[PDB]
Amino acid sequence: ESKRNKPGKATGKGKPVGDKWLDDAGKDSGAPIPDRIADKLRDKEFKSFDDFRKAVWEEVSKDPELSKNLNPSNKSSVSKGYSPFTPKNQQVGGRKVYELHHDKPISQGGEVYDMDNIRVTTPKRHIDIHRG
Amino acid sequence: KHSISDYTEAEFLQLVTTICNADTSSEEELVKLVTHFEEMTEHPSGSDLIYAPKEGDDDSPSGIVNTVKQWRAANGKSGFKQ
Ligand SMILES: [Zn+2]
């Protein structure tokens, strides 16, 4: 009874990112999935979007270019497949961690596991996107 | 565990160490501890003390405890249990 909970295989290219990768998450449509992560996850089967989410953060933990911009506590979090905490000023109530967003919504036929359709957002930005 | 005056310093360090190490069974449990920490400390930086330190701050568990202890002492707040 939720599309995002149906199994599928990951596809898509992503984009080159730099040190300001997660800074981009609070702006515009959010930050892209890094090309380097897309290389690792392409063609893997996922039983739910939540399982895909876990895999993204585990690959972040393993990637020295992506993990080096997280502090020790956030490193511990992504090692467990958790989403890392944003700065306080980008949090909204009990939503305190980076959120994965579908640029074309799944409800409007957007692809669930196409990484070219996925963005990384802060809670503050994700809420604003979904309200225009 | 309703206020920071309910914790000894050693007990608070235990809480902070658990958070820093993500020593939980779910992301939900971790978020709950972080929320608890922010409520206990009353510090304006909130979770930034743990996850977004300002340049040169000591973000080890003992460093965070020191930052909290000093801020509370200097800003008229009750301290740890003896
Ligand atoms: Zn979204």
Coordinates of N, CA, C and O in Angstrom, one line a residue, chain A residues 12-93:
Chain A
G12 N 20.9 4.9 -12.7 CA 21.2 6.4 -12.8 C 22.7 6.7 -12.5 O 23.4 5.9 -11.9
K13 N 23.1 7.9 -12.9 CA 24.5 8.3 -13.0 C 25.0 9.2 -11.8 O 26.1 9.1 -11.4
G14 N 24.1 10.0 -11.3 CA 24.4 11.0 -10.3 C 25.3 12.1 -10.9 O 25.4 12.2 -12.1
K15 N 26.0 12.9 -10.0 CA 26.7 14.1 -10.5 C 28.0 14.2 -9.7 O 28.1 13.7 -8.5
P16 N 29.1 14.8 -10.2 CA 30.3 15.1 -9.4 C 29.9 16.1 -8.3 O 29.2 17.1 -8.5
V17 N 30.4 15.9 -7.1 CA 30.2 16.8 -5.9 C 31.6 17.1 -5.3 O 32.6 16.4 -5.5
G18 N 31.6 18.1 -4.4 CA 32.9 18.5 -3.7 C 32.6 18.6 -2.2 O 31.7 18.0 -1.7
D19 N 33.4 19.4 -1.5 CA 33.3 19.5 -0.1 C 32.0 20.1 0.4 O 31.6 19.9 1.6
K20 N 31.4 21.0 -0.4 CA 30.1 21.7 -0.1 C 28.9 20.8 -0.4 O 27.8 21.4 -0.4
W21 N 29.1 19.5 -0.6 CA 28.0 18.6 -1.0 C 26.8 18.8 -0.1 O 25.7 19.2 -0.5
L22 N 27.0 18.6 1.2 CA 25.9 18.7 2.2 C 25.4 20.1 2.4 O 24.3 20.3 2.9
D23 N 26.2 21.1 2.1 CA 25.8 22.5 2.2 C 24.7 22.8 1.1 O 23.7 23.4 1.4
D24 N 24.9 22.2 0.0 CA 23.9 22.2 -1.1 C 22.5 21.7 -0.7 O 21.5 22.1 -1.3
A25 N 22.5 20.7 0.2 CA 21.2 20.1 0.7 C 20.1 21.1 1.2 O 18.9 20.8 1.0
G26 N 20.5 22.2 1.7 CA 19.5 23.2 2.1 C 19.1 24.2 1.1 O 18.4 25.2 1.4
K27 N 19.5 24.0 -0.2 CA 19.2 25.0 -1.2 C 18.5 24.3 -2.5 O 18.6 23.2 -2.7
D28 N 17.7 25.2 -3.2 CA 17.1 24.8 -4.5 C 16.4 23.4 -4.4 O 15.5 23.2 -3.6
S29 N 16.8 22.5 -5.3 CA 16.1 21.2 -5.2 C 16.8 20.1 -4.3 O 16.4 19.0 -4.3
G30 N 17.9 20.6 -3.7 CA 18.7 19.7 -2.9 C 20.0 19.3 -3.6 O 20.1 19.7 -4.8
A31 N 20.9 18.5 -3.0 CA 22.2 18.1 -3.6 C 21.9 16.8 -4.4 O 21.0 16.1 -4.0
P32 N 22.6 16.6 -5.4 CA 22.5 15.3 -6.2 C 23.1 14.1 -5.4 O 23.9 14.3 -4.5
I33 N 22.7 12.9 -5.8 CA 23.4 11.7 -5.4 C 24.8 11.8 -6.1 O 24.9 11.9 -7.3
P34 N 25.9 11.6 -5.3 CA 27.2 11.7 -5.9 C 27.4 10.6 -6.9 O 27.0 9.4 -6.7
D35 N 28.0 10.9 -8.1 CA 28.4 9.9 -9.1 C 29.1 8.7 -8.5 O 28.9 7.5 -8.9
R36 N 30.0 8.9 -7.5 CA 30.8 7.9 -6.9 C 29.9 6.9 -6.1 O 30.2 5.7 -6.0
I37 N 28.8 7.4 -5.5 CA 27.9 6.5 -4.8 C 27.0 5.7 -5.9 O 26.8 4.5 -5.7
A38 N 26.6 6.4 -6.9 CA 25.8 5.8 -8.0 C 26.6 4.6 -8.6 O 26.0 3.6 -8.9
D39 N 27.9 4.8 -8.8 CA 28.7 3.6 -9.3 C 28.6 2.4 -8.4 O 28.6 1.3 -8.9
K40 N 28.6 2.6 -7.1 CA 28.5 1.5 -6.2 C 27.2 0.8 -6.0 O 27.1 -0.4 -5.8
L41 N 26.1 1.6 -6.1 CA 24.8 1.1 -5.9 C 24.1 0.7 -7.2 O 23.1 -0.1 -7.1
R42 N 24.5 1.1 -8.4 CA 23.8 0.7 -9.6 C 23.7 -0.8 -9.7 O 24.6 -1.5 -9.4
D43 N 22.5 -1.2 -10.2 CA 22.2 -2.6 -10.4 C 22.0 -3.5 -9.2 O 21.8 -4.7 -9.3
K44 N 22.2 -3.0 -8.0 CA 21.9 -3.7 -6.7 C 20.3 -3.7 -6.5 O 19.6 -2.8 -6.9
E45 N 19.8 -4.8 -6.0 CA 18.3 -4.9 -5.7 C 18.1 -4.5 -4.3 O 18.8 -4.9 -3.4
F46 N 17.0 -3.7 -4.1 CA 16.6 -3.2 -2.8 C 15.2 -3.6 -2.5 O 14.3 -3.5 -3.4
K47 N 14.9 -4.0 -1.3 CA 13.6 -4.5 -1.0 C 12.6 -3.3 -0.6 O 11.3 -3.5 -0.6
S48 N 13.1 -2.1 -0.4 CA 12.3 -0.9 -0.1 C 13.2 0.3 -0.3 O 14.4 0.2 -0.2
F49 N 12.5 1.4 -0.4 CA 13.3 2.7 -0.5 C 14.1 2.9 0.8 O 15.2 3.5 0.7
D50 N 13.6 2.5 2.0 CA 14.4 2.6 3.2 C 15.7 1.9 3.2 O 16.7 2.3 3.8
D51 N 15.7 0.7 2.6 CA 16.9 -0.1 2.4 C 17.9 0.5 1.5 O 19.1 0.5 1.7
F52 N 17.4 1.2 0.4 CA 18.2 2.0 -0.5 C 18.9 3.2 0.3 O 20.1 3.4 0.2
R53 N 18.1 3.9 1.1 CA 18.5 5.0 2.0 C 19.7 4.5 2.9 O 20.8 5.1 2.9
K54 N 19.5 3.4 3.6 CA 20.6 2.8 4.4 C 21.9 2.6 3.6 O 23.0 2.9 4.1
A55 N 21.8 2.0 2.4 CA 22.9 1.7 1.6 C 23.7 3.0 1.1 O 24.9 3.0 1.1
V56 N 22.9 4.1 0.9 CA 23.5 5.4 0.5 C 24.4 5.8 1.7 O 25.6 6.2 1.4
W57 N 23.9 5.8 2.9 CA 24.7 6.4 4.0 C 25.9 5.4 4.4 O 27.0 5.9 4.8
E58 N 25.7 4.1 4.3 CA 26.8 3.2 4.4 C 27.9 3.5 3.4 O 29.1 3.4 3.7
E59 N 27.6 3.8 2.1 CA 28.6 4.1 1.1 C 29.2 5.4 1.4 O 30.5 5.6 1.2
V60 N 28.4 6.4 1.9 CA 29.0 7.7 2.4 C 30.1 7.4 3.5 O 31.2 8.0 3.4
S61 N 29.8 6.5 4.4 CA 30.7 6.2 5.5 C 32.1 5.7 5.0 O 33.1 5.9 5.6
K62 N 32.0 4.9 3.9 CA 33.2 4.2 3.3 C 34.0 5.1 2.3 O 35.1 4.7 1.9
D63 N 33.4 6.2 1.9 CA 34.0 7.1 0.9 C 34.8 8.2 1.6 O 34.2 9.2 2.1
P64 N 36.2 8.2 1.5 CA 37.0 9.2 2.2 C 36.7 10.6 1.7 O 36.9 11.6 2.5
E65 N 36.3 10.8 0.4 CA 36.0 12.2 -0.1 C 34.7 12.7 0.4 O 34.6 13.9 0.7
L66 N 33.7 11.8 0.6 CA 32.4 12.2 1.2 C 32.4 12.3 2.8 O 31.9 13.2 3.4
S67 N 33.0 11.3 3.4 CA 33.0 11.2 4.9 C 33.9 12.3 5.6 O 33.7 12.6 6.7
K68 N 34.9 12.8 4.9 CA 35.9 13.7 5.5 C 35.2 15.0 6.0 O 35.8 15.7 6.8
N69 N 34.1 15.3 5.4 CA 33.4 16.5 5.8 C 32.3 16.3 6.9 O 31.4 17.2 7.1
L70 N 32.3 15.1 7.5 CA 31.5 14.8 8.7 C 32.4 14.7 9.9 O 33.5 14.2 9.8
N71 N 31.9 15.1 11.1 CA 32.7 15.1 12.3 C 32.6 13.6 12.8 O 31.8 12.8 12.3
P72 N 33.4 13.3 13.8 CA 33.4 11.9 14.4 C 32.1 11.4 14.8 O 31.8 10.2 14.4
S73 N 31.2 12.2 15.4 CA 29.9 11.7 15.8 C 29.0 11.4 14.6 O 28.3 10.3 14.6
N74 N 29.0 12.2 13.5 CA 28.3 11.9 12.3 C 28.9 10.8 11.5 O 28.1 10.0 11.0
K75 N 30.2 10.6 11.5 CA 30.8 9.4 11.0 C 30.3 8.1 11.7 O 29.9 7.1 11.0
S76 N 30.2 8.1 13.1 CA 29.6 7.0 13.8 C 28.2 6.7 13.3 O 27.8 5.5 13.1
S77 N 27.4 7.7 13.1 CA 26.0 7.6 12.7 C 25.9 6.9 11.3 O 25.2 5.9 11.1
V78 N 26.6 7.4 10.3 CA 26.6 6.9 8.9 C 27.2 5.5 8.8 O 26.8 4.7 7.9
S79 N 28.1 5.1 9.7 CA 28.6 3.8 9.8 C 27.6 2.7 10.1 O 27.7 1.6 9.6
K80 N 26.5 3.2 10.8 CA 25.4 2.3 11.1 C 24.3 2.4 10.1 O 23.2 1.7 10.3
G81 N 24.5 3.1 9.0 CA 23.5 3.3 8.0 C 22.4 4.3 8.3 O 21.5 4.5 7.6
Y82 N 22.7 5.0 9.4 CA 21.8 6.2 9.8 C 22.0 7.4 8.9 O 23.2 7.6 8.5
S83 N 21.0 8.2 8.7 CA 21.2 9.5 8.1 C 21.9 10.5 9.1 O 21.5 10.5 10.2
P84 N 22.9 11.3 8.6 CA 23.6 12.1 9.5 C 22.8 13.4 9.9 O 21.8 13.7 9.2
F85 N 23.1 13.9 11.1 CA 22.4 15.1 11.6 C 22.8 16.4 10.8 O 24.0 16.5 10.5
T86 N 21.8 17.2 10.5 CA 22.1 18.5 9.9 C 22.5 19.5 11.0 O 22.2 19.3 12.2
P87 N 23.0 20.7 10.6 CA 23.1 21.8 11.6 C 21.7 22.2 12.1 O 20.7 22.0 11.4
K88 N 21.6 22.6 13.4 CA 20.4 22.9 14.1 C 19.5 23.8 13.3 O 18.2 23.6 13.3
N89 N 20.0 24.8 12.6 CA 19.2 25.8 11.9 C 18.5 25.2 10.7 O 17.7 26.0 10.1
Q90 N 18.8 24.0 10.3 CA 18.1 23.3 9.2 C 17.2 22.2 9.6 O 16.6 21.5 8.8
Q91 N 17.1 22.0 10.9 CA 16.2 21.1 11.5 C 14.8 21.6 11.7 O 14.6 22.8 11.9
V92 N 13.8 20.7 11.8 CA 12.4 21.1 12.1 C 11.8 20.1 13.0 O 11.4 19.0 12.6
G93 N 11.7 20.5 14.3 CA 11.2 19.6 15.3 C 11.9 18.3 15.4 O 13.2 18.3 15.5

